Amino acid sequence: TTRLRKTRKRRGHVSAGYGRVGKHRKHPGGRGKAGGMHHMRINYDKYHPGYFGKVGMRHYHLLKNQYTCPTVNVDKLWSLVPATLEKAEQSKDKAAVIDVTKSGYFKVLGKGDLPKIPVIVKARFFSKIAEKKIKAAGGACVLTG
């Protein structure tokens, strides 16, 4: 769609949309991020604060997977495993076990609220709040590794 661009309509006007006084010069103001330190400083303060300087200690050969840790919340979980819910509503004996690793998360955080059905949650890590909420539900906590 060259059709739809402004040059087509703009054609026939001498300036070509850039203005007669100032002109479309090749490179006013430098190239790229050049001039950030001096002439383009006002733009940097605001828009991009914190751009200049170094802060934290550097990590050589940082490797992801060492630190990876995908997190599910307590408010979910149920979405994790609909039939069991109708099983574990009833009975008051046994409980629907949620291995959180098998869906593919390691940590559990209790941001949400959960129905009061006894359940067992197995995850590599548990947030402090998640444990309190799960216990209230009558659920149990199990660690894998």
């Binding site: 067992i120 149990a140 906590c141």
Partner: protein, 199 residues
């Protein structure tokens, strides 16, 4: 640089027009691969294509749950079933002489996988007469083999899910799984710091 945009970060300062790789071949490449898979399997016909590969847990902690296909089996694993490492490439089993078995569990997975494969395996006589060993010579009884199956598709690897729903025991509700983890961290930091305070 004007207005509120991202500060630009483009890597085109070198003579990049020389080294532009385009992908107009992509369908022509598909169909050239695909012609030589077929023309391979014309020569084989009865014989299945690739060769059998083991079940293998990936290394680091974020792919530790998953299972994939490996490179090849193990000199320990083939000793249990009783193949030579020498002969196994004729039948179509990969040997990998580097990979150990540290666990008993990873051993007994691949030994089951090998024994199930050698149950599948019909092996023709070289002619004229039958000859035992070197599984066996199958006689001219001979149940109908289908043609090349491909070996991966014949004996595939399915993230086997599910848990048995369980009674909540005593010492399940009691033990506090934040504080159990939170000890285990702060012990493992202060190991040498403990052994001063102990002694």
């Amino acid at each position: 640089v004007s207005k509120n945009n991202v500060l630009p970060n483009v890597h085109l300062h070198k003579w990049w027009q020389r080294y532009v790789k385009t992908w107009f071949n992509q369908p022509g490449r598909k169909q050239s691969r695909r012609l030589r898979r077929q023309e391979k399997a014309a020569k084989l016909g009865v014989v299945p294509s690739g060769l059998l590969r083991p079940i293998v847990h990936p290394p680091t902690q974020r792919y530790n749950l998953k299972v994939r296909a490996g490179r090849g089996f193990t000199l320990e694993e083939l000793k249990s079933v009783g193949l030579s490492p020498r002969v196994a490439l004729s039948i179509g089993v990969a040997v990998d002489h580097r990979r150990r078995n540290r666990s008993a569990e990873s051993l007994n997975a691949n030994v089951t996988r090998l024994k199930a494969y050698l149950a599948k395996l019909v092996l023709f006589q070289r002619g004229s007469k039958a000859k035992k060993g070197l599984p066996a010579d199958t006689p001219k009884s001979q149940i109908q083999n289908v043609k090349h199956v491909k070996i991966s598709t014949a004996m595939p690897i399915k993230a086997s899910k599910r848990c048995k729903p369980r009674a909540i025991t005593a010492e399940e509700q009691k033990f506090m799984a934040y504080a159990t983890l939170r000890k285990a961290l702060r012990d493992c930091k202060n190991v040498g710091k403990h052994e001063k305070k102990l002694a």
